[PDB]
Symmetry: C3
Amino acid sequence: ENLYFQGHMASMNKEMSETLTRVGPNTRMGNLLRRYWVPALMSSEIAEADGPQVRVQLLGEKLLAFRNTDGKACLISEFCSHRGVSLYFGRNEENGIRCAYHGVKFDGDGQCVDVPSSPQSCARMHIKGYPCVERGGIVWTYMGPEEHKPSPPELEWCTLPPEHVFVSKRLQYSNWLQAMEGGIDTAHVSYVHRFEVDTDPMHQGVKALDYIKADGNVKFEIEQTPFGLSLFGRRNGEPDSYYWRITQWLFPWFTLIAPFGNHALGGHVWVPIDDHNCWAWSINWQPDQPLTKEERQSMEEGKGIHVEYEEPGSFIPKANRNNDYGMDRVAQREERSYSGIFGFSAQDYSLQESMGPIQDHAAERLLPTDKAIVMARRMLNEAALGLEQGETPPALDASEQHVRPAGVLLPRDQDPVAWAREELADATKKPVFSL
Amino acid sequence: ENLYFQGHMASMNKEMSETLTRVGPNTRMGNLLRRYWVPALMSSEIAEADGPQVRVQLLGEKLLAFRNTDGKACLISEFCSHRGVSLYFGRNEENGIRCAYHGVKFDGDGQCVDVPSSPQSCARMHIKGYPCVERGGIVWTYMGPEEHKPSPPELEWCTLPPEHVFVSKRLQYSNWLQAMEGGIDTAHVSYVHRFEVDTDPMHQGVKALDYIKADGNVKFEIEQTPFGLSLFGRRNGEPDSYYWRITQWLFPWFTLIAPFGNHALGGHVWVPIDDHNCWAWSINWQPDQPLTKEERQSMEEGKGIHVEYEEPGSFIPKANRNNDYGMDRVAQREERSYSGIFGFSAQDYSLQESMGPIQDHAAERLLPTDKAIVMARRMLNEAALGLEQGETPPALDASEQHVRPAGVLLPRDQDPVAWAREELADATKKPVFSL
Amino acid sequence: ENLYFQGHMASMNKEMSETLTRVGPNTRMGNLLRRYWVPALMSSEIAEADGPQVRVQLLGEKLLAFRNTDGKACLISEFCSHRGVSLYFGRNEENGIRCAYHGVKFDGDGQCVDVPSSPQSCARMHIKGYPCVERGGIVWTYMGPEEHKPSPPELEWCTLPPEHVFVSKRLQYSNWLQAMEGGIDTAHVSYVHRFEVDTDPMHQGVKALDYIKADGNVKFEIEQTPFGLSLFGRRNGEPDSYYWRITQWLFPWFTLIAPFGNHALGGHVWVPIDDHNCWAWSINWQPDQPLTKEERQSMEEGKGIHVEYEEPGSFIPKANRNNDYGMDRVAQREERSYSGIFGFSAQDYSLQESMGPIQDHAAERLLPTDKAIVMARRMLNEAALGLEQGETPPALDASEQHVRPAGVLLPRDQDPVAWAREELADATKKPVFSL
Ligand SMILES: O=C(O)c1cccc(C(=O)O)c1
Ligand SMILES: O=C(O)c1cccc(C(=O)O)c1
Ligand SMILES: O=C(O)c1cccc(C(=O)O)c1
Ligand code: FES
Ligand code: FES
Ligand code: FES
Ligand SMILES: [Fe+2]
Ligand SMILES: [Fe+2]
Ligand SMILES: [Fe+2]
């Protein structure tokens, strides 16, 4: 798809829309996204060895996640080869999962340890077992061909001490793309999060807010990096200066969000369960120090990008489709909430959810504010279509994801792009740039 | 479809069935029904200016209903042009709805007041905003081409003082047609409402009941009026006389039901939400006087054609799919209810619901009692197929809907058709004809 | 499909999979299974004459079951000919069901007793009424062409005194085939029922258990009988002897399970509601004596093959999709349950359910233990495809179903097949062979 149609940016065509949103096994985006380490499951889920196997579907592939006797977090297919029973009901023990029907056993790597019936027939029963690692507090799995297994991701929050990072998933009933797009559209922070930024503990009392809750019209400068796209979201800061909100889009699914002051750094990744559902991952980290108990609780409590859940055990958020996201029309009128939904993530996924599981890319009237998005789109669309032609994809090299976002006031003189070549090299080993 | 097959009346063919039941945007029935003012939403819903916008889907078009700051009940599409978020979460204020994501604002007429990003790009964002009026206590919207906007409907209950009319909607999980057909089939009143007519306050203690709960075999005389069809439902009244139940079918969806005695006048309209769902509207009015507090409460209480709802806020009736319509097999046996369902509307929609969202027009064995229906069918089918050929449709002129139904005892001598040319001219400005 | 592919048994092809699993009106399996008496409904459901008609869908045919005034359990179609209303809401009285809309009445045989509108038009309204009988405590209906109506089934539990038999249905959310396959795969009894056999009252404290909870690798000998297939499931019993578990598969859907000791005899039949749902029927009978109150309660209580239900009235089991079958991961670890599900049927249908409503016959890696299944498969597939060619099907003659299962210890010398020609003739009129 061309970058600009009729002077306005270009809506996605049919073919393109599906290139991107269809993420099933053996589809364009499917094959592309599989080449990257996939954030499967929190380690806190299978914390115990020989513990409850947990059903996780990633990229339209129903899978099962367990910690082998040895302490190895594994990911196998959920369905036994023998008669397609769920291995959920198998036995996680002796470094494998033995299915409950006729005793067939699966390695973490998904090999058939033991077939009671015909031991000769072990090699036929081999199921889909995919390798894993333990960065982030997240179990990362690799689903792309064995040979093109890349280096585990080295985002700052992957690498920093655990006490420095906080991670949550939230189940969101929409395709990954849209949900991600909300991370790469700072303009929305002006409107839908207008009042919430004052109230929330991760966004509050920072001079940036003044600038945000003012010039909503974000002019975007996109720089293509080998880690994805640098998004310089310009917003009239001071009469002499612009408040650039520099959000790093780490291809293909992780945002590193611009800081809000000294307050903890924030970030996301979007893991598509299928074509209509995604895992919305939020990470807060703090480079210099660890997370205060006060910070941690508040993140735990569902403040910030994190979200309170309906019941323990459920990654479905307390505010959801059913709940009307606790639409408080009082508060709408009382200018305590634009959307009428409180909570940061709730505000965001509510709108994302409302679009439908897949928005009508057809009827999208894209605007300026949508540069980030369009650029990321093409970037994805190229990669996938490219990978179709055997073109190795972008940002596989995890050393390059050694980066941080930024929020600086720059005189309208300084090209921000330049500024980040200068100021933002080795950016993890520097201070953070806030406000 | 021919009027009679094999001597019996004619079942609908495939093509015809869908002409009629498919009501989506840009389908035969869709285009036809759009030419008429559509009863969207009760005014009592958006009673307040700048109040909660209420999600209403009409004719398979998800729409949103609000009262602009000015007091103008509007109907806009539910989805923002920018990224297809629900405007539900927008802001009803300053004579528009400003979507919560990137601040785009919509006029009541559905124009883009303000696009923050690119003010130049306002005219691209124009969404579907459709005109409205305030008859009936119902917000009526016009969805057909701008030019073919007709005169607001002038049914007696539209025009009489509000204190004279009572209006309710009930959410019914079935296509509009069948649901409507129940209004144009007086024969059923004999069987399924047999005992309920004694118990209910709008039908009780009137000599008509004797006649109804006797000769269920209704012979129908249909007269085509320019307002739709006059249905003379003959039923052996007295040995010398017939009890004609004259139900006016006001094309395309409103029944004016024959009176039951001095008791309030009754009526319906069926607004199809989609191909499988409809809004079942019941109106009781009283021409000469206003509705007694005793009448009003009892109508409010869910007696008569009205229906008690599951919870406040919900237009889903208390008796529903789930509830088994409170099947009381005791009462069935105790001859307190034919169907086993109590309540008038409940009795009716239960059966209508049971057919399936769309009945199997294929396997319909139509009978005599089905004249009304078949005639109304063809009338519809012609109009739509006609409108396909650019043939302006029937009953657009709302002066002609200045009519009332009737229930008279006529010697078997008098042709009832004649009787209504004589007796039923200027019928609104007359007495009502009951029993 | 060939019996063996690549030395391993043969997975079902596409065409075959659907031959078997598609059971709708007028499909291969549909037509085949219709030729046999179908266990519709327990008599205990319509125990009363003129009682509540009960909605039952069999073989993808929504039907209605009532006991005519006379005491004749009937099965009619659920939908009225007039306008396709549910006859559920009709009146069971005067040896018929009179539909509630316009008073049309249906015979048990599904003839139109009385059409009020046009009495002439009675013969057009004839609906699907199918004959019935009262064996088992189950209402059996015949749905195949009138002429090919066979003899009511004469399984031992059909014929023995009622106090000798116990019957339950359990609603299982999966196609019939898989669910049935679990009856014809004794190998699973080793693994998934390992610990439950000790605990349960119908399986406990019998020397057979030792043998079962030992050699799970069942070698199968299948003998084709005219009643279906005799399945000699061999399992290393004693060093000198094999524990043959002889399960009779009575074509097309009834297992007679091998005994567990003196304990009551057990059996199943699978009635497909549609392509994705089935009625799982469990029968326990006792040939020599009637069922002890202690046996009966315990069967009633949901022990054995029977199952406790969520609420009274519901044939949905207490442990279900929602409940996670009360996965007790404690118990899994505590070796009180392999699967983690307690209860015999629960253990079984859980796994069956987990496969999906239809398992992925494509990805089935069949093993030795799957002889029974494969043989039964072909047998079915032949019959149906055969019936397609007008080839009258197997096991219609109910005298031949005068048979019982068996569990004998046979020296590894004795061919078990031979043994049953000798020992198992007139087997109903003999002792039972246990352990
Ligand atoms: O793009 C941003 O400015 C921003 C701010 C706060 C949260 C998020 C998010 O992606 O959740 C983005
Ligand atoms: O056609 C009729 O006689 C009748 C009577 C009562 C109610 C209704 C209805 O349309 O709801 C119709
Ligand atoms: O095949 C068997 O051994 C067996 C044992 C217990 C129950 C069942 C069943 O079909 O439910 C089968
Ligand atoms: S289905 Fe897993 S052991 Fe057979
Ligand atoms: S989606 Fe409505 S403001 Fe952008
Ligand atoms: S639908 Fe049954 S009486 Fe008409
Ligand atoms: Fe947001
Ligand atoms: Fe009715
Ligand atoms: Fe079993």
